[PDB]
């Protein structure tokens, strides 16, 4: 157990890794999952929320008490709300009015302010409004799809944690769902350096396969499928792409909760499905690693559970 800390943000990171036992066969590679929902705010996005705020503070762009703005309906808003409460900042989020009352309650429980934009305008409307608010009011915008501190924190923390966790082992393939691409890009850089024969695999929704060259579309893999290629994604880092359908991802998340006792979100079921497909290709004795971004408790009101 960690010695006492003065601020909850000092416990972000250092997340555990579990080997899967039942949803993958003894004929396939070993599959390991990094539990990023064990971060204190509940998802991988604690890491980038802390990193973007700390970099802007270190560059003098913000100081405690300042207000930030970000267009987000997902885990990054929860992450930024959590970090801003812990570090003494004020957070404003823009988002379409289709966001659940419970999700709103979570951001407001950390003290954030919400600015709801027209549902018919989806994320475009929220992005437009956040830029308007930034220019009118002087708010700092973290900009999770452009800020280099996003992939950099994964290069400094998440990736090197994996190198410590797998010392004396070879990772043969690392797979990650792409939302901002920061996880895949920063972890992948660190793992490719240490394990030059590793395969790095991007995961995206079948229904919006923009990295594969297809057109954006509506999909249900929350946390993935931005519909564009983010600034924070290194499109050279991955050797291949695995597309996952809505239903396939949800069926795997249900299997993993019941058969491994690991209760994770939709994007985690997509990651595990892809990792098992890759493990079958690599066969016995090899090592496949992926990341579970968020916990199934955040999805109890969705079709997943």
């Amino acid at each position: 157990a960690q010695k006492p800390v003065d601020n909850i943000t000092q416990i972000i990171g250092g997340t555990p890794v579990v080997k899967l036992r039942n949803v993958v066969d003894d004929n396939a590679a070993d599959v390991y999952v990094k539990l990023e929902y064990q971060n204190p705010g509940g998802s991988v996005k604690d890491r980038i929320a802390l990193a973007m705020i700390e970099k802007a503070e270190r560059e003098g762009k913000i100081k405690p008490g300042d207000t930030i703005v970000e267009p987000t309906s997902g885990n990054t808003g929860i992450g930024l709300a959590f970090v801003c409460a812990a570090k003494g900042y004020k957070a404003v989020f823009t988002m379409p009015e289709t966001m659940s009352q419970e999700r709103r309650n979570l951001l407001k429980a950390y003290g954030a302010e919400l600015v709801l934009t027209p549902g018919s305008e989806a994320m475009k409307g929220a992005i437009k409004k956040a830029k308007e608010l930034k220019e009118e009011h002087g708010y700092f915008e973290p900009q999770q799809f452009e800020n280099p501190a996003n992939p950099e924190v994964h290069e400094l923390t998440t990736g090197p944690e994996l190198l410590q966790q797998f010392e004396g082992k070879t990772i043969d393939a690392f797979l990650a769902g792409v939302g901002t691409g920061g996880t895949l890009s920063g972890v992948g850089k660190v793992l490719k350096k240490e394990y030059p024969n590793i395969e790095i695999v991007a995961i995206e929704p079948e229904a919006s396969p923009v990295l594969s060259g297809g057109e954006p579309g509506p999909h249900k893999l929350q946390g993935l499928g931005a519909g564009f290629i983010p600034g924070t994604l290194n499109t050279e880092i991955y050797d291949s792409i695995i597309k996952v359908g809505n239903d396939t991802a949800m069926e795997m998340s249900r299997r993993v909760a019941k058969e491994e006792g690991i209760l994770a979100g939709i994007s985690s079921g997509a990651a595990i499905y892809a990792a098992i497909q890759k493990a079958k290709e690599l066969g016995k004795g090899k090592t496949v690693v992926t990341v579970l971004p968020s916990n199934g408790e955040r999805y109890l009101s969705t079709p997943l559970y």
């Binding site: 987000t72 997902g74 990054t76 994320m123 901002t180 509506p218 946390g223 993935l224 499928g225 519909g227």
Partner: peptide, 4 residues
């Protein structure tokens, strides 16, 4: 739309 997306939830990120």
């Amino acid at each position: 739309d997306y939830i990120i």
